[PDB]
Amino acid sequence: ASNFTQFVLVDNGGTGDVTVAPSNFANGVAEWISSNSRSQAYKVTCSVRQSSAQNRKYTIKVEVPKVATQTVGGVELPVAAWRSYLSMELTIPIFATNSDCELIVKAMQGLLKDGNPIPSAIAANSGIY
Amino acid sequence: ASNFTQFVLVDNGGTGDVTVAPSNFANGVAEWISSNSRSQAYKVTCSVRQSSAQNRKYTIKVEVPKVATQTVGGVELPVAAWRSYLSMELTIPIFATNSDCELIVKAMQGLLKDGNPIPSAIAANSGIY
Amino acid sequence: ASNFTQFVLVDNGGTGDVTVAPSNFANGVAEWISSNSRSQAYKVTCSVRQSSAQNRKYTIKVEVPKVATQTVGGVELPVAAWRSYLSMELTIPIFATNSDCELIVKAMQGLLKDGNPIPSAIAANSGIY
Amino acid sequence: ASNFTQFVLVDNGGTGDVTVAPSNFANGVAEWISSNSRSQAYKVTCSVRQSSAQNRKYTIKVEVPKVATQTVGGVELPVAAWRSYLSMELTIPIFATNSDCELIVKAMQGLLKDGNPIPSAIAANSGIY
Amino acid sequence: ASNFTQFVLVDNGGTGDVTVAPSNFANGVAEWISSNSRSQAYKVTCSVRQSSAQNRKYTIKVEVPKVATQTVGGVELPVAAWRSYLSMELTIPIFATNSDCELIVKAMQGLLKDGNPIPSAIAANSGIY
Amino acid sequence: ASNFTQFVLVDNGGTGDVTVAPSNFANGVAEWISSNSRSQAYKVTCSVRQSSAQNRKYTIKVEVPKVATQTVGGVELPVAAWRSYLSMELTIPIFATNSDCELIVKAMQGLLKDGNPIPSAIAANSGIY
RNA sequence: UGUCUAAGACAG
RNA sequence: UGUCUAAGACAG
Numbered sequence: 001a002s003n004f005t006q007f008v009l010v011d012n013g014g015t016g017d018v019t020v021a022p023s024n025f026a027n028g029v030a031e032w033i034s035s036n037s038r039s040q041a042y043k044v045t046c047s048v049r050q051s052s053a054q055n056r057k058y059t060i061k062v063e064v065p066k067v068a069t070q071t072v073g074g075v076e077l078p079v080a081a082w083r084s085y086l087s088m089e090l091t092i093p094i095f096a097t098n099s100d101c102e103l104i105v106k107a108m109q110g111l112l113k114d115g116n117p118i119p120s121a122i123a124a125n126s127g128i129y
Numbered sequence: 130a131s132n133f134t135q136f137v138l139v140d141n142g143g144t145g146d147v148t149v150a151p152s153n154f155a156n157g158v159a160e161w162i163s164s165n166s167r168s169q170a171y172k173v174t175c176s177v178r179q180s181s182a183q184n185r186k187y188t189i190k191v192e193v194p195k196v197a198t199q200t201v202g203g204v205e206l207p208v209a210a211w212r213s214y215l216s217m218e219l220t221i222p223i224f225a226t227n228s229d230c231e232l233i234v235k236a237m238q239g240l241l242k243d244g245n246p247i248p249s250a251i252a253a254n255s256g257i258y
Numbered sequence: 259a260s261n262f263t264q265f266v267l268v269d270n271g272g273t274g275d276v277t278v279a280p281s282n283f284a285n286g287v288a289e290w291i292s293s294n295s296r297s298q299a300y301k302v303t304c305s306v307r308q309s310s311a312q313n314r315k316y317t318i319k320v321e322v323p324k325v326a327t328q329t330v331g332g333v334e335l336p337v338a339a340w341r342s343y344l345s346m347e348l349t350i351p352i353f354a355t356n357s358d359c360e361l362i363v364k365a366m367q368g369l370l371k372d373g374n375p376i377p378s379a380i381a382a383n384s385g386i387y
Numbered sequence: 388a389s390n391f392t393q394f395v396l397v398d399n400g401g402t403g404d405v406t407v408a409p410s411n412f413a414n415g416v417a418e419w420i421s422s423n424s425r426s427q428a429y430k431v432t433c434s435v436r437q438s439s440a441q442n443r444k445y446t447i448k449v450e451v452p453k454v455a456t457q458t459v460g461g462v463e464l465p466v467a468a469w470r471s472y473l474s475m476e477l478t479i480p481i482f483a484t485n486s487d488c489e490l491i492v493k494a495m496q497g498l499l500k501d502g503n504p505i506p507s508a509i510a511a512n513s514g515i516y
Numbered sequence: 517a518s519n520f521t522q523f524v525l526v527d528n529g530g531t532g533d534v535t536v537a538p539s540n541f542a543n544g545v546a547e548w549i550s551s552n553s554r555s556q557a558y559k560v561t562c563s564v565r566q567s568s569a570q571n572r573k574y575t576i577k578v579e580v581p582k583v584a585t586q587t588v589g590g591v592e593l594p595v596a597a598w599r600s601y602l603s604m605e606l607t608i609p610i611f612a613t614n615s616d617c618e619l620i621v622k623a624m625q626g627l628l629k630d631g632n633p634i635p636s637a638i639a640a641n642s643g644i645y
Numbered sequence: 646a647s648n649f650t651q652f653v654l655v656d657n658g659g660t661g662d663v664t665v666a667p668s669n670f671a672n673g674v675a676e677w678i679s680s681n682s683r684s685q686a687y688k689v690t691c692s693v694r695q696s697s698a699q700n701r702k703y704t705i706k707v708e709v710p711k712v713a714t715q716t717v718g719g720v721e722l723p724v725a726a727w728r729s730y731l732s733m734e735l736t737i738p739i740f741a742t743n744s745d746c747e748l749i750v751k752a753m754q755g756l757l758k759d760g761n762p763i764p765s766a767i768a769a770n771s772g773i774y
Numbered sequence: 775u776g777u778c779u780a781a782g783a784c785a786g
Numbered sequence: 787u788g789u790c791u792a793a794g795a796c797a798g
Contacts, residue, residue, distance in 0.1 A: 002258060003246040003249045003250050003255075003257055003258065004246060004257045004258055005246060007239070007242075007245040007246055008239055008242075008245075009236050009239045009240065010232060010235045010236050010239055011235065011238075011239055011242075012235075018236070018239075028256065030246070030256075030257035030258075032246075042236065044240065044247075046246075046247055046250070046257050047256070047257075048250075048255075048256045051788090051789065051790090052789070052790075054211075054790090054791095055789095055790085057789090058250075058251060060240070060247060062236060062237070062240060064232060064233045064236050066222060066224060066225055066226075066229050066591070067228070067229055067232060068225075068226040068228055068229050068553070068589035068590075069587060069588075069589050069590040069591070076591075080181075080183065080184070080222060081183065081222050081224050081591045081593075082222065082224075082591065083222070084219065084220060084221045084222065084225065084229075084233050085219070085220045086217065086218075086219050086233070086236075086237065087217065087218050087219075087787095088215070088216075088217045089214075089215075089216045089217070089788095090213070090214070090215050090216075090251070091213060091214040091215075091216075091789095091790085091792095092213050092251075093195070093211040093212070093213065095195070095210070095211060096195075096211075096213065096254070097254075098252060098253060098254055100195065100213075101251055101252045101253070101254055102252045103139060103193065104193050104213050104215075104251065105241065105248045105251055105252050106139045106140060106141075107138050107139050107147070107171070107191060107193050107215075108191070108215060108241050108248075109140075109238075109241050109242070109243070109248075110136070110137060110138040110139055110140055110147075111138060111173065111189070111191055111215075112234070112237050112238050112241060113136075113137075113140075113238075114238070115136075116136040117132045117133065117134060117136055117159075117161075117175075118173075118175055118189060119234045119237075119238070120132055121132050121175070121177075121187075122187060122219065122221075122230055122233065122234055123227065123230050123231050123233075123234045124132075124227060124230070124539070125185075125225070125227055125230055125539070125549060125552075125553070125554050125557070126132065126177075126539040126540060126549065127159075127175075127176075127177040127539065127540035127541070127542050127547070128132060128133045128154070128159035128175060128540070128541070128542070129131055129132060129133060129520070129538050129539065129540055129541035129546075129547075130538075131388060131389060131538070133387060133388055133389065133541075134388050135388065150382075150384075150388075151384075151387045151388045151389070152382065152383065152384035152385060152387065153384060153385035153386070153387050153435070154385075154386065154387035154391070154412070154541070154542070155385055155386065155387075155412075155415035155417075155434070155435070156414065156415050156543065156793075157542030157543045157793095158542075158793050159387070159542075160385070160387070160793085162383065162384070164382075164485055165383075165484065165485075166383065166481065166482050166483055166484040166485075166487070167383050167443065167481040167482075167483070168481040168482050170383070172792095174793060176542065176793075177540070177542070182595070183555075183595070185554060188793080190792080190793075192792075202328065202330075203328040203329050203330040204326050204327075204328045204337065204339045205326065205339070206339060206340075206482050207482055207484065208482075212791095212792080214790090214792065216792080222555075222591075223553065223554040223555040223595075224553050224554075224555045224589075224590070224591040224592075225553055225554070226552070226553045226589040227551065227552075227553075228589075229553070229589070259516075260516060261504045261507055261508055261513075261515060261516060262504065262515050262516060263504065265497075265503045265504060266497055266500075266503075267494050267497045267498065268490060268493050268494050268497055269493060269496075269497055270493075276494075283515070286514075288504075288515040300494070302498065304504070304505055304508070304515055305514075305515075306508070306514040306515075312469075316505075316508075316509060318498065318505060320494055320495070320498060322487075322490060322491050322494050324480075324482070324483070324487060339482065340441075340480040340482060341480075342477070342478065342479045342480065342483060342487070342491045343477070343478040344475065344476075344477050344478075344491070344494075344495065345475065345476050345477075345478075346473065346474065346475035346476070347473075347474050347475070348471070348472070348473050348474075348509065349471065349472040349473075349474075350471045350509075351453075351469040351470075351471065353453070353468065353469060354453070354471060354512065355512075356510065356511055356512055358451075358453060358471070359509055359510045359511065359512055360510045361397060361451060362451050362471045362473070362509065362510075363499065363506045363509055363510045364397050364398060364399075365396050365397050365405075365429070365449055365451050365473075366449070366473065366499050366506075367398075367496075367499050367500075367501075367506075368394075368395055368396045368397055368398055369396065369431065369447065369449060370492065370495050370496050370499065371395075371496075372496075374394045374395075375390045375391065375392065375394060375417075375433070376433055376445075376447060377492045377495075377496075378390055379390055379433070379435070379445075380445060380477065380479075380488055380491065380492055381485065381488045381489045381491075381492045382485055382488065383483065383484075383485055383488055384390075385415075385434075385435040386390060386391050386412070386417040386433055386434075386435075387388075387389060387390060387391060389774075391774060392518065392774060393517060393518075393774070408769075408771045408772075408774065409544075409771070409772050409774035410564060410771055410772045411544050411563070411564055411565050411772055412543065412544030413543055413544050413563075413565060414543075420770070420771070422614060422769060422770050422771065423613050423614050423770060424610065424611055424612065424613050424770075425566070425572055425610035425611075425612075425770065426610040426611050428770075440791095460715045460716045460717065461713075461714055461715060461716040461721070462713045462714070462715050462724075462726055463713075464611045464726065465611055465613065466611075518774060519762040519765045519766050519771075519773055519774065520762060520773045520774055521762060523755070523758075523761040523762055524755055524758075524761075525752050525755045525756065526748060526751045526752050526755055527751065527754075527755055527758075528751075534752070534755075544772065546762070546772075546773035546774075548762075558752065560756065560763075562762075562763055562766070562773050563772070563773075564766075564771075564772045567776090567777065567778090568777070568778075570727075570778090570779095571777095571778085573777090574766075574767060576756070576763060578752060578753070578756060580748060580749045580752050582738060582740060582741055582742075582745050583744070583745055583748060584741075584742040584744055584745050596697075596699065596700070596738060597699065597738050597740050598738065598740075599738070600735065600736060600737045600738065600741065600745075600749050601735070601736045602733065602734075602735050602749070602752075602753065603733065603734050603735075603775095604731070604732075604733045605730075605731075605732045605733070605776095606729070606730070606731050606732075606767070607729060607730040607731075607732075607777095607778085607780095608729050608767075609711070609727040609728070609729065611711070611726070611727060612711075612727075612729065612770070613770075614768060614769060614770055616711065616729075617767055617768045617769070617770055618768045619655060619709065620709050620729050620731075620767065621757065621764045621767055621768050622655045622656060622657075623654050623655050623663070623687070623707060623709050623731075624707070624731060624757050624764075625656075625754075625757050625758070625759070625764075626652070626653060626654040626655055626656055626663075627654060627689065627705070627707055627731075628750070628753050628754050628757060629652075629653075629656075629754075630754070631652075632652040633648045633649065633650060633652055633675075633677075633691075634689075634691055634705060635750045635753075635754070636648055637648050637691070637693075637703075638703060638735065638737075638746055638749065638750055639743065639746050639747050639749075639750045640648075640743060640746070641701075641741070641743055641746055642648065642693075643675075643691075643692075643693040644648060644649045644670070644675035644691060645647055645648060645649060672781075673781095674781050676781085688780095690781060692781075704781080706780080706781075708780075728779095728780080730778090730780065732780080
């Protein structure tokens with residue numbers, strides 16, 4: 001009914017939460033930015049398009065700042081040393097119903113649920129073993 | 130320990146739960162598949178490589194199938210009507226701390242959290258607006 | 259004395275037991291087939307030939323059918339939706355004594371023993387990890 | 388979780404027991420070797436590749452050495468007088484469910500069970516008759 | 517029986533010890549990382565392969581961070597100024613028994629034993645004299 | 646002082662001890678050999694060079710022989726059945742402090758310490774798993 | 775860098 | 787990077 005609203009990106013349970021809010025809608029690409037310099041902000045963008053006759057495709061991008069030893073509002077170079085990039089590409093066949101889509105979402109939440117292999121590997125600077 | 134363990138990918142409160150298990154590590158690609166025929170299984174893969182001299186890149190893939198029974202040559206075979214594909218790439222600088230990495234994980238979780246814009250949009254078969 | 263006899267290929271207690279019986283032994287190839295429709299039968303063949311001047315080569319083959327009914331034009335025939343094919347070759351130097359051979363057999367048995375890597379990987383539609 | 392572990396290849400009660408341990412797993416090929424002189428070790432390798440679009444192919448290999456000492460020039464080296472070579476290929480359609488696979492495994496186990504035709508023929512330096 | 521466990525890499529007798537723990541097993545290459553940013557971590561990797569018909573070869577790599585004036589979690593460039601690299605290549609003929617191998621290990625420990633020329637030379641930024 | 650002294654390479658508690666002594670420094674390569682015939686001796690070599698404008702590189706080599714008596718031309722000669730080769734290269738930045746270097750040494754010692762994964766694996770003729 | 779018959783050869 | 791019949795193909 002209008003989902004383009006701000007939300008909590010990083011939840012630290014009230015104390016030090018990171019909120020990200022609508023900052024751009026140019027070309028139908030929703031963008032959320034955190035309240036920072038663009039170089040240190042948390043950024044989220046999302047868009048959908050029918051990639052092919054059979055599929056629709058969501059493209060979600062997230063940018064997360066390196067915070068340890070960060071100097072707020074400072075000029076930190078090289079940019080590549082201070083930022084992590086997440087590029088998510090979700091492909092859904094045009095036959096998927098809302099239910100099918102809810103399932104897909106659940107699978108994504110499950111993939112990243114706290115305690116599961118993938119997130120704990122990433123959280124620990126590790127691979128699988 | 131060993132983080133290469135099975136985990137529940139789709140949670141439907143104990144019943145109807147899609148759990149996925151380690152199934153392969155050949156060629157440095159950790160694989161987990163659901164307990165079905167290979168033709169109908171859910172599949173999750175992960176791999177980390179040192180992409181740049183100063184970056185590490187995780188490549189994660191999830192395959193959500195739409196199971197069906199096809200009648201090929203007058204014989205029924207377990208198959209997939211179609212598949213939904215999640216393909217994500219994460220680039221983290223080598224300067225990232227475990228705390229810096231935890232931040233990335235929390236952000237990804239918050240991104241897909243129930244009720245937030247993106248999963249809402251996806252589950253409703255719509256864009257952000 | 260004869261070893262070209264009937265034997266249990268698949269052991270399901272005393273019930274579902276799959277038995278295979280001698281069918282033919284032409285051209286040095288012993289063939290065993292389970293009962294009922296040849297089209298849905300299990301097949302096992304074995305032969306030993308003196309490959310080189312120092313080696314004897316065994317060639318064991320097993321076919322596991324996926325029993326199904328095929329309807330076409332309203333006509334149904336008992337068929338095999340597909341078959342799983344096992345093809346093994348065992349080479350043993352002519353210097354192997356009967357003890358040496360028993361050892362080779364125990365090695366083959368151990369390889370497939372319940373709970374060991376290979377059989378469990380196979381049983382679970384998986385690879386090694 | 389991991390199935391790439393140590394296991395008993397030859398079972399001589401609790402004594403002469405031949406154990407094989409993970410040695411290497413490069414290029415999708417899992418290798419296991421028994422201890423002591425590599426020159427007299429038992430070898431087991433396994434790999435699964437998606438052969439056709441409908442089949443996955445397993446390739447299991449086992450080497451049984453005939454332990455001996457080789458004296459030459461008065462210099463003795465632990466060697467293998469010769470080796471027995473087992474090379475098996477198992478093809479399984481992607482339609483096989485976990486049950487289908489367990490059956491295939493039980494079939495392989497039955498084929499080599501003590502007292503059945505093939506294993507006894509082999510064990511006795513014989514063929515079928 | 518499973519040697520891929522964490523261990524103490526730098527022993528300072530309890531007070532300030534550096535522990536390194538399993539972090540990756542992609543392609544059979546065991547990797548241990550210390551609890552740091554990947555750029556400041558202590559890293560250890562190990563693998564074996566039969567380099568030739570006659571020899572097996574262990575390849576051990578160690579990475580040690582420059583600690584003096586280090587800024588924990590900071591971005592320190594150039595990478596080459598803050599890291600030491602150890603590349604160990606151990607070649608063992610396939611005739612070596614476990615005893616032969618134990619000897620080889622002892623020789624390595626002896627080479628680096630506290631008080632011996634090589635380590636004291638390295639520890640003092642010196643050569644031999 | 647002079648760090649170019651003899652030291653015990655293989656320690657077997659005073660008896661059976663392989664001690665190695667300075668034997669050459671020609672061309673900047675410090676050499677130590679055990680007290681045997683050159684054909685059967687243990688050999689340790691070391692050299693440091695300023696590899697880069699900002700690195701120093703140590704190159705260390707150890708040769709562990711398998712002594713034997715060969716009968717060449719009807720005459721017995723002291724020889725080596727084979728040799729095991731340890732070849733290691735260490736690169737330390739010029740910015741490394743003596744304390745930074747001590748760290749490197751301690752890490753190498755901890756690496757090869759009795760009971761830790763790597764020496765365990767080596768001595769057992771296996772990989773890490 | 776990777777291999778070896780190993781301070782010297784080999785292969786990129 | 788972008789697409790797909792998806793750890794492997796395609797297109798810059």
